[PDB]
Design a protein around this ligand. Sequence first.
Ligand code: CL
Length: 287
Amino acid sequence: RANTNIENIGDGAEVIKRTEDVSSKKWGVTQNVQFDFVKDKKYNKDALIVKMQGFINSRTSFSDVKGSGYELTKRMIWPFQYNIGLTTKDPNVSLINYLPKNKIETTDVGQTLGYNIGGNFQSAPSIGGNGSFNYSKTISYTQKSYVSEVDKQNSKSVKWGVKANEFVTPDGKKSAHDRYLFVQSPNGPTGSAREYFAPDNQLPPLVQSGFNPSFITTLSHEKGSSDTSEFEISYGRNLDITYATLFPRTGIYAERKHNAFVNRNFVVRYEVNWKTHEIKVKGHNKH
Ligand SMILES: [Cl-]
């Protein structure tokens, strides 16, 4: 037990903490996942609090459009939504909580999942408001210009979508669905495609760089049902394309292809062993 990260959380209860880090250079994703087993002699179920962190590259790019008639057209590919989800199919496991639980539109998201001996979970959309829990886990992330929604939630799966919402632009606030979002008339000489789009200082981090997720869901398992369960964690993005064409007579013309690339996700299959309190990577879609 000395080589295992174990926290005593009160009489007859402790948390066994495991981690896995799994990255894909192909998908531009890192999953830094924490898996905390709640061991409580006064709770008839096993529980695994799964905290999903890491990185999802924006995969934003600016390029020329090849072909006849497209000589004056440039393309910006950028992430309209980041996808984070966890799914199970084994009858022996279900999801009993998830954070965030509701739509949240604030630039900063900071929430807490608390546990009290006897199988009692509670959540709050804030950090620091409570010192009554036997154990707690928090989530924290920034999503400037984006909003978080629970796209799917049920006893077997949860999916969050962190979606483009409203942006600060030189001309004022613009909707994520405005076809002229990020478009501009070019001025300089070098690397022309980049110049048809808003400079980096106008692109918020979720467009320019990527997203650092922080989400939780708790897996529930009846003590005495089968030893292991598999589940998949998916991180990725949906990309839009904004096309900008410079017309000699009328200026810059923009068109958007919304949902241009959907579900560009890195999926990792894990196994939890409820008896040995271990986690293993079983498979993934790196190739
Ligand atoms: Cl991609």
